[PDB]
Subunit: 334 residues, 4 copies
């Protein structure tokens, strides 16, 4: 039996999580809450996508409900998360994806509405973080509020886990070249505390600070205090790339690194970590469900103890599919 999932917020992450849930069939969506989008606008927003194309299926509105592939979905319009009746709609798990309730106390308001477990699709200050394929076996059913970290952490963590297991990362610095997001502006406009992010996204790349490489040390406890980095935001649509420059404890030629990464991508991390040797570019990874894909031909090594590794990730489809996979594993553990 599939678990029943409600979604709070119909932004980019909520719509793509609903799309991934209906495409994979692992979980069932029964309720969506958004206070600023009405039903017909939800139909229009779900049906058409500039990046991932039209939805393969039927979506319509009937009797005040959103019907996707013949499945009706209840729609709520509450602005206070403590007043949403999740239990009346039958939702067992709730995906919090608005990005403003990230603490345990703020995201715990969904438990008052009748939900059982809450999954935060964002980095959290105090909720435990789980990344699929890295530390998701440490989950137990006593935990009620779960965080899934972010897209950059989900790209960096499996590759760093493989490299640290085989060669012992001593210290590393990460640079990610990121696509544009919803928090940026088309022209030069006002941004409150981040002055670089208010500049025009079409004409410039923004060197942005990120905390994903530090969160890898929270997901992998042996790498705590050994990773940090920054970001650049280039005017491109969807696909981002992580560049990790690291120092290794044991000697490692580049062919050995390629061999162990390919071996990990075949058996244990299948569907999470990818491997390729072709002359790929960014748009070759559009609508790819992998967390990260190792680029063998793009990296370079200075010597046996100082390497630079390149990994591609779709920061839209991969993260949503990992949210669905985490919910499926959580339902299986019950």
């Amino acid at each position: 039996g599939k678990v029943k999932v409600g979604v709070n917020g119909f932004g980019r992450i909520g719509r793509l999580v609903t799309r991934a849930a209906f495409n994979s069939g692992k979980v069932d969506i029964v309720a969506i809450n958004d206070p600023f989008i009405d039903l017909n606008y939800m139909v229009y927003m779900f049906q058409y996508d500039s990046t991932h194309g039209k939805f393969h299926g039927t979506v319509k509105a009937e009797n005040g409900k959103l019907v996707i592939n013949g499945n009706p979905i209840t729609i709520f319009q509450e602005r206070d998360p403590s007043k949403i009746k999740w239990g009346d709609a039958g939702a067992e798990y709730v995906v919090e994806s608005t990005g403003v309730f990230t603490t345990m106390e703020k995201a715990g308001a969904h438990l008052q509405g009748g939900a059982k477990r809450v999954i935060i699709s964002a980095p959290s200050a105090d909720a435990p973080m789980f990344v699929m394929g890295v530390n998701h076996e440490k989950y137990d059913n006593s935990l009620k509020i779960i965080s899934n970290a972010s897209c950059t952490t989900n790209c960096l963590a499996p590759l760093a886990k493989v490299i640290h297991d085989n060669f012992g990362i001593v210290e590393g610095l990460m640079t990610t070249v990121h696509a544009i997001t919803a928090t940026q502006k088309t022209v030069d406009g006002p941004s409150g505390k981040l002055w670089r992010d208010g500049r025009g996204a079409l004409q410039n790349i923004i060197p942005a600070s990120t905390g994903a490489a530090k969160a890898v040390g929270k997901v992998i406890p042996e790498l705590n205090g050994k990773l940090t980095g920054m970001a650049f935001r280039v005017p491109t649509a969807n696909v981002s790339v992580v560049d990790l420059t690291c120092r290794l404890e044991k000697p490692a030629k580049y062919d050995d690194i390629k061999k162990v990464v390919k071996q990990a991508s075949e058996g244990p991390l299948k569907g999470i970590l990818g491997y390729t040797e072709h002359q790929v570019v960014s748009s070759d990874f559009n609508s790819d469900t992998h967390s990260s894909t190792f680029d063998a031909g793009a990296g370079i090594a200075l010597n046996d103890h100082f390497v630079k590794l390149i990994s591609w990730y779709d920061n839209e489809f991969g993260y949503s599919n990992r949210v669905v996979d985490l919910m499926a594993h959580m339902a299986s553990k019950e």
Copy 2:
């Protein structure tokens, strides 16, 4: 003596109007009001521009005032326009540029603060409209609230005036290919009543409805009910182009049209309407102060009574310079 000007709102139009005022020297800026931008952020926003480059001069903050080229400017942070003390700062004219006070009643709240005349840098439902070089001689000193129409109206009106004076436009339809603005979104996001405008600006052109060609009939009364059109919003930075397809009462070869447009651009409409015969593109008109520049080589004529005319305009610098010119003419009429 130059007139004293206050600016309400430090958005794109307000900053570019301040830049044009300090570059041309026709008017003097003494006060700026914005409730969401503090002083140091005003210094940063005025100093750096992605489109028009760095400011040629000195800008700094001292004693709670914005000093530009040695000239101090008082800063207000009021959110209610009736409580701004324009008379204490010495501001005689006030440019309303926030885009939310466009009616006569809403924009008349600046008169309670001590201002003499208010100029709206937007289309208005009930305030009189004036376009420089077309109908600006109809202004008199009894009028207190003035509208300057928009950038597309300021591009279309002088060319339509010349063509109607020489050949008698019977009917016309306008298509403008517009650059991206601040109301658009980088990715697919929510827009309230305009569903097409919420889609991603980097990946698609939006067929948007505009009322500029109808407002030309309000500026030129003989063309009332003979012009309408639409718009496209392509992913480009700054320069837009107007394509006017019209039918003429009298026969007109294309060389005669070129001759009368060049003659008008030399003597009477100098600095407002431009003329070129070179193989120009859009970025050749970056930071151009003309209202419109007629492209001789780009247009086409089917016969002697059915022509298509092409005109370029910078919808950022040209409109701000026209606001400054209108204020200078208003001060001269006193």
Copy 3:
């Protein structure tokens, strides 16, 4: 029995024609000629596409042949079209898509190699032009060299045919907003006779002259001398739009135009002319196989005799699918 097709040139049009042929299954590709692309580079170029995504199927190289979905394809590397042995490979029809052999004499060199009929996927000065759904019933088996006009002609001709059949177009002018093509440059570079086309495609829109609206009069003989127009080349990837401003002989409200266009798109022109009433943008028509899709909400009418109609087209997939459909009809007529 499907007809056997050879393709000369593996550029954008040749690769997309091969993709459309394998996706639809109407014709069979048996031979490809290109003097500058070797076999493994053909595999790489066919497998990956930045615009239309990865190929849904298997493509590989074996025994000096290109195997697509289990079908082997002979590869030629000749630079002279008279020396290609089309008859040895079994190719009955030949698609000439290099863009340099467009006259009847130059494209007739493929007949010496053993081909039966040659189809030019470009406008031609002397070869007869056929557009599917408009004048393709005028083809007979005595003709050997056929032209399929271009993408803009294939978008404009069915809509103009419907409007002229129902209301009598008197005169019209067309503006198309076109996506970037392979003849443009990334930065400012040298172009021989077209100085505007040598400028940077990412930063500017080029007002380009086109002959598609004049070629509509060659496809529809009653509209000869009544249509002409120009073009703009905006920095976007794939989808273009045609704006037709026309004058009608009989009175026509906009609802009547919508009714007759929807009626034509249902029955007779099904799959060629589309109809929509949704709030669509350009990326909603990516990988769409229609020749043209009428946008009901985007157009505008000044009065009963002067209208402006908007039509979307994918200038990559639609034209290739029309080439395949024309070849299927030509094979059926034998």
Copy 4:
């Protein structure tokens, strides 16, 4: 007395070198050779620029000569560099900028035409390399063929020189995020030996291999074998950024690094290496003449021996100004 300079090739580098020479006034241009551009097309190409705007001055053609600011320039159309009469035009130095004569033997053909010294504006396999402000004092008048390395080497070398002089770089890896160049394609097209570079520049970032960090070891001999790296090519117009991840022999806090970089940018490396602490983006460095500008706020340090440094560079204006400065120093050494 200013030295007389001829330019071979009127591509991007040649036009920008001519523009920098006329803007700075250090050298005098007397002759330009290009076999594919005629005189009026040279006037059009020099007058208009999409990136750097219109030329501030007068440019025209008279008597078969290119007159810039009242200075006449002889035009040659030879395709063989041994047949260009540089001595008849009076050119003493010759800038070879076509990018196809980079060896000493191929670039020595200009000496047969009457030139004295040849400067290659590209990396060279056997000609000596000089970077202004780093090793340009090692030049002597016995040398006849000189290379100026590339834009990325000119950005990386002064910062690496300062950091190695103060703290002792042990090993380092460089990632540069580069703007698009003339060798890329607008859509997916054929590229011979570099399959990634043939993909569409507007829709994807290309991980490209570069040899600039290895050439730094040729310019600074103590860093030989300690630096290498790669590149990404994002769809942006003009400004690139270098990210250097290095390990230091002596302990260095980030404030000490900022102090020594600011001290070097003030006195010795004035005009070559810049320093800023503002919240800058890429378009803030458009038409900047510095070789590199250190970004203090964008970098990050993991500990006292492992840092990441960020430097901005205009890869068009800065390199051309360094070519002009190298020619001025070479003329002063005579």
